[PDB]
Amino acid sequence: GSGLNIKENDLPGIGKKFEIETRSHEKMTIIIHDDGRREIYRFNDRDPDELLSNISLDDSEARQIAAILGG
Amino acid sequence: GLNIKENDLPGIGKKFEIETRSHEKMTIIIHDDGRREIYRFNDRDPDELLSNISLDDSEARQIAAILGG
């Protein structure tokens, strides 16, 4: 329902996957690869089968975007 | 490479336009009241919005924690 929901899954030997549902009921998946790569996926609010957008960031880029996003 | 342009929106907040090394583009608006709005655009078409998301201050900080480790 409401509130922020974050589901974390280990991808053995690969990295970590975070599935996020926001208070606005929007959905995003973040994959953090062991090598540093971050992948963000944005899906249709009501259709998990439809990818709206995706972006790949290296570790340094993800950190800089994080700095902007957070505080 | 990575390019970031920061502008003030007077009386509203701040705007960051970001171009990545993968040549993907995003705009982040940070409102004074704490709202974050994120806009994703077509790499070659600035007038086509791919996706957008609204986060409160709490959410933005949590997601930032995940992204930046």
From Swiss-Prot, chain A:
Subcellular location(s) per record: Cell membrane
Coiled-coil region(s): none
Induction comment: Part of the khtSTU operon. Induced by salt stress at alkaline pH.
A GO MF label: monoatomic cation transmembrane transporter activity
Record carries keyword Cell membrane: yes
Keyword terms of this UniProt record: Cell membrane, Membrane
Predominant localisation class: membrane
Disulfide-bonded cysteines: none
Record-level GO cellular component terms: plasma membrane
GO process annotations (BP): potassium ion transport
Physiological role: Required for activity of the potassium/proton antiporter KhtU. Involved in protection of the cell from methylglyoxal, a toxic by-product of glycolysis.
Subunit structure: The transporter is composed of the integral membrane protein KhtU and the regulatory protein KhtT.
Protein name stated in the entry: K(+)/H(+) antiporter subunit KhtT
Native organism: Bacillus subtilis (strain 168)
Residues of the full protein shown: 2 to 68 of 165
